Amino acid sequence: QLDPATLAAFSAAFRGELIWPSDADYDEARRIWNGTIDRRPALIARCTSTPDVVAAVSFARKSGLLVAVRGGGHSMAGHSVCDGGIVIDLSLMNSIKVSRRLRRARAQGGCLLGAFDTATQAHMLATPAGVVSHTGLGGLVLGGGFGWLSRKYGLSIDNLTSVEIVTADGGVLTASDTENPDLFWAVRGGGGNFGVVTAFEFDLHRVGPVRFASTYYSLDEGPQVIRAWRDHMATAPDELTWALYLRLAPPLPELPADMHGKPVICAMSCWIGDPHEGERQLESILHAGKPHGLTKATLPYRALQAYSFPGAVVPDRIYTKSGYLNELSDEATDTVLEHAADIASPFTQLELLYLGGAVARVPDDATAYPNRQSPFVTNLAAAWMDPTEDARHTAWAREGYRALAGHLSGGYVNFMNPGEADRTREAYGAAKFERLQGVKAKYDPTNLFRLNQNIPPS
Ligand SMILES: Cc1cc2nc3c(=O)[nH]c(=O)nc-3n(C[C@H](O)[C@H](O)[C@H](O)COP(=O)(O)OP(=O)(O)OC[C@H]3O[C@@H](n4cnc5c(N)ncnc54)[C@H](O)[C@@H]3O)c2cc1C
């Protein structure tokens, strides 16, 4: 129940669409990518500009409504929808202004990655972001943001030069290395904790065609593939990215039918640089086991960004457990292969990522993103369809995580699940967490933005 005058003032200041529980489109509007999260907002405000966001933030503050902010809706924790509060939905704010001469993109806070990459690639430009096109730029960048271009050019945040942000008090600020730098530090890895980012400004790089390969190895040859991967990446040049996704093999014609539906290592690699050198480099990493279902291509960067993942199936229900490794021992490798053999759903992946490169050359304290010096990420990313099977898939991720817990430290805030609010301090570490709490005390002292990997003020 909402104060009529406060609601009147909000409606008159707001140029976008309000979606109420009685509206026919409410049920589709409140769904987020993680289908396990079924929540009923009091109101969904589809913002269309920075002043719309200002109006929505101030209305939420005045009315005491719990604030969810939604970019692309990919929160693995379900943060972009709430029960009984307001969803400040940015998905209609999808514009990107690209300067070819100045190598700059200014993107609104509701953009999807593929809209961004299309816009920068119209000029043969790019900057790092995630590997699945329909992820939101907003939440991805605010947690750090990594993908194919990160070993060469760093995290998304390592290319961010300024933001426009709406703070809890309704104010509009610019944050950069010269203006509100304290806030600028915090938004580079501190999530949505400090306000709603309505525009991100990035430096861009010239990224022409990319030599790429995807292939599948039997688990029989798994130990030698994973060992080759971990040994090779420790000294690989920044231009090579090579990631392992343990999963059931998808039923695609490049793979023999006898492999369909059985656990495999899906290895995907690319070279950011001359494609002739790329071909030599990829061939040098393709043969530690017999590559089944090999696809090799020289792709526009926009097509590399649109490629993941083989099978092109959007799962309905997901649960993730993730952490970093400083090293991948033989023991940890055996544990990964054992648990991969038990994967049940054709949409689950046990992901082994290697960052390092340019990400690790940024000084630890230059941004709020923790664990630059840990190059391995493991993500037990369970994903499935049947709502009656939740427990079995959730248990796979939980027990695989616990089996690896002696090797895992930290945690990427953007891979946290709905039950992982407790992991925030360990993910950031004591020093970063304390600094973040100080910025929170300055810019969000009432903790208006708490549907995120939350940093309470003080
Ligand atoms: C299929 C898939 C693939 C992914 N791949 C990668 C990958 O390759 N690399 C990687 O780094 N991560 C990846 N992620 C994780 C992704 O970084 C996080 O899920 C991220 O939070 C998604 O952002 P979003 O805007 O889509 O999500 P939302 O659920 O809309 O929001 C996520 C969080 O950010 C906040 N938020 C969103 N936009 C804004 C904004 N403009 N201003 C302020 N707060 C905001 C929300 O309040 C919430 O706390 C992937 C996720 C999915 C589901």
TrEMBL record:
Pfam families: BBE (PF08031), FAD_binding_4 (PF01565)
Gene Ontology MF annotations: FAD binding; identical protein binding; oxidoreductase activity
PROSITE patterns in UniProt: FAD_PCMH, OX2_COVAL_FAD
Binding site for FAD: 69, 71-75, 80, 109, 131, 136, 139-140, 146, 197, 412, 414, 451
InterPro entries in the record: BBE (IPR012951), FAD-bd_PCMH (IPR016166), FAD-bd_PCMH-like_sf (IPR036318), FAD-bd_PCMH_sub1 (IPR016167), FAD-bd_PCMH_sub2 (IPR016169), FAD-linked_Oxidoreductase (IPR050416), Oxid_FAD_bind_N (IPR006094), Oxy_OxRdtase_FAD_BS (IPR006093)
Co-factor(s): FAD
Every FAD-binding PCMH-type domain range: 37-207
Keyword Oxidoreductase (UniProt): yes
Keywords: FAD, Flavoprotein, Nucleotide-binding, Oxidoreductase
Record has Mitochondrion as a keyword: no
Top-level division of the source organism's lineage: Bacteria
Entry similarity comment: Belongs to the oxygen-dependent FAD-linked oxidoreductase family.
Name of the protein this chain belongs to: Putative FAD-dependent oxygenase EncM
Species name: Streptomyces maritimus
Gene expressing this chain: encM
